[PDB]
Subunit: 136 residues, 3 copies
């Protein structure tokens, strides 16, 4: 299913020094995001850091949200995951996408400028209207 | 999209001492949940604890589930996340919502009564009917 | 909502030594997955391991993805979660489902052959078509 999402580029390097995110295959559910850094960031085990993506999106439709997940190989093989585990991006959020990266493993790891470090999917969300009942 | 969800309050303090969860903005995808505690809980790095919310919901529609996620600022900035990473609440679950809180960081942190510590979103789920094939 | 998903069994023990995954209740959103191991795997605190499921699925519909989540009791009570926190399975992925299991807790834990260690849900995903704008 395709839905149009507005995106604004916040850093000159995006699209130039490294590309805008794209779905690898037609059956891909997540987009990879890349670290828009100036210099490489070394993470010792336990450290977390905030990495800019140089992008800002505006989903604008209230039935849709985006989730940021770890990448499997990096999570499982290298211990490089998200400090907030899963990031949730609301339809009305329009600031920069920032990635909390946490080193949950036992070896230092250096994030390279432009490396793909997390992935994003867009899911339908429903807003609950609570019906108070004293018992179900 | 709005769907009606039944909710039963399990503790007298909910709605009184602190409010029932609400969507901050019209374009919010998650509801914040608050710790329905009697006393503050100090978490040393590594500790996990189970926090009641004083609420029980009953989604009751089998095409819908709820997920409990960490809050970004607390996850990323303070290392306060969920012990089971992401909690999944089924449509037929009707017991109390309980939040596993884990201190994945390096400083002790005290959870205050009524503090917002996790967030919940409602997503559509599909139930798979498996078609056995010997090869795709 | 029911959607048909093709599944191919990769190990003789699946369906025989332990069953194919099923929804416990009609209102269940996730399927439990079981470790298709030969011998029990002991995990010391900090360790991660990759566990086969002996299964391969092919969602094949591009509006649908599957997520692998920790099980609550094991995550919260025993510190046994996923090394990549949340696993995302694309509609065109057709290789074995493998589970990164991480021991985030403080006690060694042994995974038994056939034990249920993670759960899977199928969610609708949307593929974003980015509309470049200089400002929102
Ligand atoms: O990994 C993340 C998570 C969230 N956000 C943005 C989008 C979201 O709308 C806003 C607030 O996030 P939250 O999960 O509501 O947490 P908090 O209220 O603790 O800031 O920050 C990010 O850029 N990256
Ligand atoms: O953070 C959580 C996760 C789950 N639950 C409830 C809802 C769910 O229906 C029930 C069982 O959870 P599960 O993920 O199926 O795990 P387990 O079978 O290991 O108890 O517990 C919570 O209250 N909080
Ligand atoms: O827990 C997991 C996560 C993913 N996969 C499969 C499905 C997915 O299509 C493929 C690639 O996963 P990914 O999240 O894209 O990460 P990476 O590109 O780092 O391999 O591996 C698994 O078997 N188990």
């Amino acid at each position: 299913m395709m839905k149009k999402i507005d995106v604004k580029i916040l850093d000159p390097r995006v699209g130039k020094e490294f590309p805008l995110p794209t779905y690898a295959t037609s059956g891909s559910a997540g987009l990879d995001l890349r670290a828009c850094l100036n210099d490489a960031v070394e993470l010792a085990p336990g450290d977390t850091t905030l990495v800019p993506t140089g992008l800002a999106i505006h989903i604008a439709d209230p039935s849709l949200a985006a989730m940021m997940l770890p990448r499997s190989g990096l999570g499982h093989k290298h211990g490089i995951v998200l400090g907030n585990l899963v990031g949730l991006i609301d339809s009305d959020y329009q600031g920069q996408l920032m990635i909390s990266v946490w080193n949950r493993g036992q070896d230092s790891f250096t994030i390279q400028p432009g490396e793909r470090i997390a992935q994003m999917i867009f899911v339908p969300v429903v807003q609950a209207e609570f019906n108070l009942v004293e018992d179900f």
